[PDB]
RNA sequence: GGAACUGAAACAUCUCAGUACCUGAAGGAGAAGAAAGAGAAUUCGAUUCCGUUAGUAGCGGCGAGCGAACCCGGAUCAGCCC
RNA sequence: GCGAGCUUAAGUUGAAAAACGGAGGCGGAGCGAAAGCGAGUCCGAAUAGGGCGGCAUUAGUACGUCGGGCUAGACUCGAAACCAGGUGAGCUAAGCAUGACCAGGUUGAAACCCCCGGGGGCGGAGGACCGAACCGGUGCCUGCUGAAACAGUCUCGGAUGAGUUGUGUUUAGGAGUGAAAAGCUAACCGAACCUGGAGAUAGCUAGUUCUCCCCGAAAUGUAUUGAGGUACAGCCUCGGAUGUUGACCAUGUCCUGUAGAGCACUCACAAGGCUAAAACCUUAUGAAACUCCGAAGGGGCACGCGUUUAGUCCGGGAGUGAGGCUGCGAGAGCUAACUUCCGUAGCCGAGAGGGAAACAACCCAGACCAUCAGCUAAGGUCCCUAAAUGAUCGCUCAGUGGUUAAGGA
RNA sequence: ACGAUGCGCCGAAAAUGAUCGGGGCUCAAGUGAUCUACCGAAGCUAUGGAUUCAACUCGGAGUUGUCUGGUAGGGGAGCGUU
RNA sequence: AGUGGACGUAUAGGGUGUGACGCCUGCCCGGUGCCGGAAGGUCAAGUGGAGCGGUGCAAGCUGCGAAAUGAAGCCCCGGUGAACGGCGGCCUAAGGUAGCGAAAUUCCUUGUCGGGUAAGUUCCGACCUGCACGAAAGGCGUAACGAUCUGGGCGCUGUCUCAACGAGGGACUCGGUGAAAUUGAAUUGGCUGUAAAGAUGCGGCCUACCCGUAGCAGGACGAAAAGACCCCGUGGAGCUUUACUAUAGUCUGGCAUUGGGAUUCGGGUUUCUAGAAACUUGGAUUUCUAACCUGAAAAAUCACUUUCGGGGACCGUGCUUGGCGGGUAGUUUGACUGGGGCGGUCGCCUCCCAAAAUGUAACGGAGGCGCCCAAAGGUCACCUCAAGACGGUUGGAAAUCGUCUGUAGAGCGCAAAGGUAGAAGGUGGCUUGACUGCGAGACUGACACGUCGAGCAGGGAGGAAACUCGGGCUUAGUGAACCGGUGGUACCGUGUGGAAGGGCCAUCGAUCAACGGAUAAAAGUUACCCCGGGGAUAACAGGCUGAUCUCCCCCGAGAGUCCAUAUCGGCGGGGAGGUUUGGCACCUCGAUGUCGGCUCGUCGCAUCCUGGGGCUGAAGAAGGUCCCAAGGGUUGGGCUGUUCGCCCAUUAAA
RNA sequence: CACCCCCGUGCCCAUAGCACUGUGGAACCACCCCACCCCAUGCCGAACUGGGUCGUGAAACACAGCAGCGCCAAUGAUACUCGGACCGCAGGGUCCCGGAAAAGUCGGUCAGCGCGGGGGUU
């Protein structure tokens, strides 16, 4: 063994209560650990970036049912 | 040898070449797609070479 | 005739360098010199030396690095003979 | 100094003095790969960008000093080597020419001649024997700042041969010579000596001196024919600008899958009932790569509803890139190590002062200077040794105190 | 009689000479609990004194505050020799 | 040029290896070498120049440029061993002929038996199981020889038990002369502790009047040479080869020196009733003597002449071609690494570690990638998976159909984590957005790279539309830079116009996998070693630890007929000591001398003897075993360097 | 939001779901109804789908009861932990302050809020 692979510094890049420019990246994820609410659009590797400038808010009933909206 | 190859694709009238891998696998001869280079509209591309 | 350390953080091309060194000819100097040239204005008008153009052009495992010439400004300016 | 401009170089003329000398250099426009356009420009088929001017038009240039950089010995000393042209065979390694030397004793080959290959004579051969010179060094000892930079006593090898030795002479540097050790080549030969290239290179070592003030680190990350070295960050400092942006703490909010805890999936696993035993139920458990769950804390934002003083960028100079311990949390180890590797806090490095007998790390506490002044921290108060042989309820009669455990009493 | 426990006994052998730092300590100088009183540092306080910075005043000075452990290093003021 | 070989000439000269003499010297031509062959494969310059292009109005000039023909040499085919060699592992060209064998070769090893000694790791003779013998890198013998090595025996000895007495030269005392290595400074003790872990110098405690002198050799990690061992340096040098690169030398084709001619000519021209005389441009054998080389004669090397003699247009030399070329030369030969080597590893992806942010090491624990898919894409539309039970045709535990349960227990191309049931899974229709030009904004990184990305243009594709497309559910499927190939484009293109060449856009060439990648191009060895450094780092020794080692204790199964504990103590547990093999890397690489012996010793006690005890399966005696006890004592020899161990022969005991 | 009830479509996002079950009927919805063709089944008008009344609330669906199941879930007490301060040689553990689960019990629920329309008491 003695093998390993680079860190992928994934996360909630922008936490609810953070104003965001358009195109800011807010969550990094392997998949849909977050499912993108209103105003946000999710990319190829399933990072989801805000489309509209404003505050970031978490809709989060959880269990795969967590969504990131942006409010203007 | 190799299996898959990087084939080229010249336009009708021949200005361009898009180049992408096919594969001698299922594609035993066929190579006919399309794209837009010098002319406005996308034109037929014979990816034989 | 012609180095090698050395640099290239190794090392062959490269550089170190036509350096060091050996050998020949000669003088108070020597060399060179009176355009089958530079050069791109149909200009220049022997040779040598300084400033500059200029680290420009360019050469280079296009790497380490190596590097002009013309224009122009001065020092000195004689062209003579087969 | 002059300033939207600033200034010479070579030289020329003077020199107890400096002036002339505009060739030339820098600023003035940028974009582009370039043609080339031009406050615009490249990409492109037009519109999205990059660099750039407007705007803050940030003023440049010739000198002087100084901080750095470059190139050249480039802070000083220090290689083993490499190359060039020489000097050396008067030592030694061989050759050649020519001369010389080897006491003495022992043995008795052929050949030659007689009696029958054998006996006798005779003869005087030998890389023969012994042993002096001489040549050589076999073993111990002595000598070991020697009598001597290789010897001495004693012992030993040869000693007519492949011998010793004089003179003269030839052969040398990757070259000679070598009955072959890489031996000898002028007392250090796996490539002599001298002069030179030449201050070779040296990522390696050591060394780098007058004083005071102020600030003050790093031993981390990534990259590397890289690991004891460098590049760029990280951290230090000096100046300019900015102007609380810092920092702790509080509120609000969001994100997390550890401790714990649980079996709901995966692996495991404990007693039974049930049954063609997988499955199933009651009961019972462990889990870094298991999670129905899940804190404490922790990170980002916003505020400051509150105390504080740092921060940010831009320009000059750095060094550091070997860490050490302790406590907590893990891995590796044997739940070893003054072990090794990470996270984290503090000390040490760079830290003096009191305590811990002594003692970088522990506990107390950050030394501007002076005092034969006062309160305290940790730690202490019998004598050493500063300070209650303090007070009150006990506990242990073991010197336990002043070195462990399973286990026994 | 099994039990909880507080302090102790045994368990308990290493190499030059012993020891809690020593003396000595139960007629506490051991101990657990409380409470004082003092010793005790270059920490803090007092008086004097000077630098770093910063405000505040007059054409470095002086006041008030504050700061001053220090390796590589960066900066600054100065002393000595030809 | 000249010399040596050699004023020698195959009974001689050169090289290589065996190494008198004796009997001898087996097998294997596969590779390598070499010697022959030389049907065919390939192979340079040169001869040829068909064609492809520029540039000019053109004549012409000019850049490339094939086919065929071109030597040696290599591939191919024989052979060669007193050529390099090979003659073994529960197919290779073969597999060991004689002879020898525990060897100078034997690891296990002190092999087994015998010999010799009281005792024999040695030695000798047999045996053979030859780790890992062997036939001219010679095998088996050999008389004689050896300052050769090994074992034995005689002889005599101070080698020794075990030393004594004597001599002389020192050594010591006095007078004369009088150095040296060394040297931080010294007002320089013992223990025990402590500190970088071996203290005169720090702590406590003990001891010690000042100073000499003759002695000894424990300490001052004493002295001496900035460790010759080990590691490091993108140090060095010597040596090696099928590392790389060249190259003296050497072989080979063509051109010149270099020429007449006959002879066969694939061919040239004007020549003539498909044709041949003048004639060749050459090639080829063959031959010739003026070039040249060489030799003999009064004139030694050289020149002349030579009635002369031989070779001969070759040989030698100049240029150029291609091959051979460790003989020479200049160099390359990676790093991490609980010391170097060996093994392993070097880039990208997944998980745990990673301590609920991101991040985080290890030669820590697990596994994947160097691709795929013309549809496994885009879009539009449509289906729902495991598994179980009941029932069923050839099948039955599990083919296939049928019902019931069925937030998933399936699937997702490969590894896993996330994710997923309104789909990313499955199945069709259409087509290529697997587009060109851009990139607001962020994530991430020291850089450099990397990730995601709304929306705009031109134009597509699917859908009735909203809309979705600039690749795949996601995360691996990858290499800057240089130097070049291919297609466009029309920017530079040196006087001008062109072209040669260059630039740009596209694309291709990389286990450069040591994966940020030193060159286009590179292996060993050093014990003949050299330098510079390191206690940054091994071998010793001390230290820390104590796995392993040594010891004790608890339990108690059984053994002990009986009876656990007179003794012994399974399977398990607890400690101690620091003597073993270690680990670790702390002081020491400007030096800490290392194993065994000898000489001196002193200490512990886990006690071999001796002394005092308890219990005993203790009648007695001799014992066993435990307790207290460190005063003293603890033998001599054979074997081996040994420690050890074995043995001889004794002991209170060894 | 006059009172109920139906069809649909949201918010919510198992305290709403399962099962047992009863009411429902041409009003709404639902099966049945036929198929050459629109349109379709990798076979079947089962599914889409096109043409409709009877019939029937069977099934599905809506709505009520329902605490067997699931779903939620205290308090209390711990586990653990931020800071402080300690002991054990060690594995380990204690104390002060404050934050504080998970599991279980107690107990809670077969929901809760809109919007448009259709038909009822005519
Ligand atoms: Mg491993
Ligand atoms: Mg170099
Ligand atoms: Mg070199
Ligand atoms: Mg010169
Ligand atoms: Mg000269
Ligand atoms: Mg002269
Ligand atoms: Mg701008
Ligand atoms: Mg200046
Ligand atoms: Mg400076
Ligand atoms: Mg600089
Ligand atoms: Mg030097
Ligand atoms: Mg003799
Ligand atoms: Mg004899
Ligand atoms: Mg000799
Ligand atoms: Mg003799
Ligand atoms: Mg030399
Ligand atoms: Mg040589
Ligand atoms: Mg010598
Ligand atoms: Mg030099
Ligand atoms: Mg480093
Ligand atoms: Mg830097
Ligand atoms: Mg800020
Ligand atoms: Mg703030
Ligand atoms: Mg746990
Ligand atoms: Mg954390
Ligand atoms: Mg505000
Ligand atoms: Mg700076
Ligand atoms: Mg480091
Ligand atoms: Mg560390
Ligand atoms: Mg372990
Ligand atoms: Mg350590
Ligand atoms: Mg270490
Ligand atoms: Mg330091
Ligand atoms: Mg400090
Ligand atoms: Mg201190
Ligand atoms: Mg202490
Ligand atoms: Mg003290
Ligand atoms: Mg110290
Ligand atoms: Mg200190
Ligand atoms: Mg310490
Ligand atoms: Mg304390
Ligand atoms: Mg006081
Ligand atoms: Mg106190
Ligand atoms: Mg007192
Ligand atoms: Mg106990
Ligand atoms: Mg009292
Ligand atoms: Mg007081
Ligand atoms: Mg005080
Ligand atoms: Mg003070
Ligand atoms: Mg004052
Ligand atoms: Mg300070
Ligand atoms: Mg201070
Ligand atoms: Mg200071
Ligand atoms: Mg031999
Ligand atoms: Mg034997
Ligand atoms: Mg032997
Ligand atoms: Mg032999
Ligand atoms: Mg025997
Ligand atoms: Mg034998
Ligand atoms: Mg042989
Ligand atoms: Mg022999
Ligand atoms: Mg003899
Ligand atoms: Mg001899
Ligand atoms: Mg003998
Ligand atoms: Mg005597
Ligand atoms: Mg005497
Ligand atoms: Mg005297
Ligand atoms: Mg005298
Ligand atoms: Mg100690
Ligand atoms: Mg210590
Ligand atoms: Mg002392
Ligand atoms: Mg002292
Ligand atoms: Mg002595
Ligand atoms: Mg050294
Ligand atoms: Mg050395
Ligand atoms: Mg080398
Ligand atoms: Mg040659
Ligand atoms: Mg050639
Ligand atoms: Mg070589
Ligand atoms: Mg290495
Ligand atoms: Mg993390
Ligand atoms: Mg680290
Ligand atoms: Mg899909
Ligand atoms: Mg888009
Ligand atoms: Mg579009
Ligand atoms: Mg359409
Ligand atoms: Mg092209
Ligand atoms: Mg390269
Ligand atoms: Mg790398
Ligand atoms: Mg030598
Ligand atoms: Mg050192
Ligand atoms: Mg060390
Ligand atoms: Mg050691
Ligand atoms: Mg050892
Ligand atoms: Mg020393
Ligand atoms: Mg010494
Ligand atoms: Mg005892
Ligand atoms: Mg006794
Ligand atoms: Mg008895
Ligand atoms: Mg004894
Ligand atoms: Mg509670
Ligand atoms: Mg608190
Ligand atoms: Mg805490
Ligand atoms: Mg609490």
Swiss-Prot record, chain A:
The alphabetical list of record keywords is:
Ribonucleoprotein, Ribosomal protein, RNA-binding, rRNA-binding, tRNA-binding
| GO molecular function, a single term | rRNA binding
**Membrane-spanning residues:** none
Among the GO biological process terms of this entry, one is:
translation
Q: Name one GO cellular component term.
A: cytosolic large ribosomal subunit
Answer whether the UniProt record assigns the keyword NAD to this protein: no
Cysteines joined through disulfide linkages:
none
This chain's function reads: Binds the 5S and 23S rRNAs and also the tRNA in the P site.
Return the similarity comment. Belongs to the bacterial ribosomal protein bL27 family.
> How the protein assembles, per its UniProt entry?
Part of the 50S ribosomal subunit. Contacts protein L18.
Full protein name:
Large ribosomal subunit protein bL27
Organism listed in the record: Deinococcus radiodurans (strain ATCC 13939 / DSM 20539 / JCM 16871 / CCUG 27074 / LMG 4051 / NBRC 15346 / NCIMB 9279 / VKM B-1422 / R1)
Q: What is the lineage of its organism?
A: Bacteria, Thermotogati, Deinococcota, Deinococci, Deinococcales
* First-to-last residue of the parent protein present: 12 to 83 of 91
From Swiss-Prot, chain B:
Q: Name one Pfam family in it.
A: Ribosomal_L33
Q: Output the PANTHER family linked to this UniProt entry.
A: 54S RIBOSOMAL PROTEIN L39, MITOCHONDRIAL, LARGE RIBOSOMAL SUBUNIT PROTEIN BL33M
Instruction: Give the family from UniProt.
Output: Belongs to the bacterial ribosomal protein bL33 family.
**Subunit note:** Part of the 50S ribosomal subunit. Contacts protein L35.
Q: For this protein, what is any one GO molecular function term?
A: rRNA binding
What is this protein's record name?
A: Large ribosomal subunit protein bL33
| Any single GO BP term | translation
User: Per its UniProt record, what Gene3D superfamilies does this chain match?
Assistant: Ribosomal protein L33 (2.20.28.120)
Superkingdom of this entry's organism?
Bacteria
